[PDB]
Ligand binder design. Structure first.
Ligand SMILES: C/N=C(/NC)NC1CCN(c2cc(OC)cc(OC)c2)CC1
Ligand SMILES: CCc1ccc2[nH]c(-c3cnnn3C)nc2c1
Length: 105
């Protein structure tokens, strides 16, 4: 399970999931709702996958956790236009994440 040294990451993820702009990213991109996603995006990532990986010991370090957070945002900018609703949400969430992370790094 998660080492207590990563509790600060657990909190950041909780706060991201609560954010207004988090809705596109809470669960894996859903083929019932979005077509052609995995055709373009080789390594999907989302906050529920991160939450399970973190809580069950699948991140050894904060760097691995942060890499998955950035993957959420990098995938979003690969798939979505910047002026789309989901594209805008990804930019908001990247800023929010980086602001929280910078309190530690
Ligand atoms: C600004 N905050 C939120 N949520 C907290 N916005 C969302 C965004 C749009 N929306 C939505 C979008 C869909 O796309 C296929 C399908 C769908 O089926 C239920 C719902 C739900 C509301
Ligand atoms: C209402 C749930 C929902 C609907 C449509 C979505 N689209 C995306 C997304 C993420 N990254 N790219 N897209 C297009 N998440 C979504 C969540």
């Amino acid at each position: 399970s998660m080492h207590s040294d990563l509790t600060f990451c657990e909190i950041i993820l909780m706060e991201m999931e609560s954010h207004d702009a988090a809705w596109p990213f809470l669960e894996p991109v859903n083929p019932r709702l979005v077509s052609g996603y995995r055709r373009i995006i080789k390594n999907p990532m989302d906050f529920s996958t991160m939450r399970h990986r973190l809580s069950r010991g699948g991140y050894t370090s904060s760097e691995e956790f942060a890499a998955d957070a950035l993957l959420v945002f990098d995938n979003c900018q690969t798939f979505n236009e910047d002026d789309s609703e989901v594209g805008k949400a990804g930019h908001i969430m990247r800023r929010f994440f980086e602001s929280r992370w910078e309190e530690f790094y």
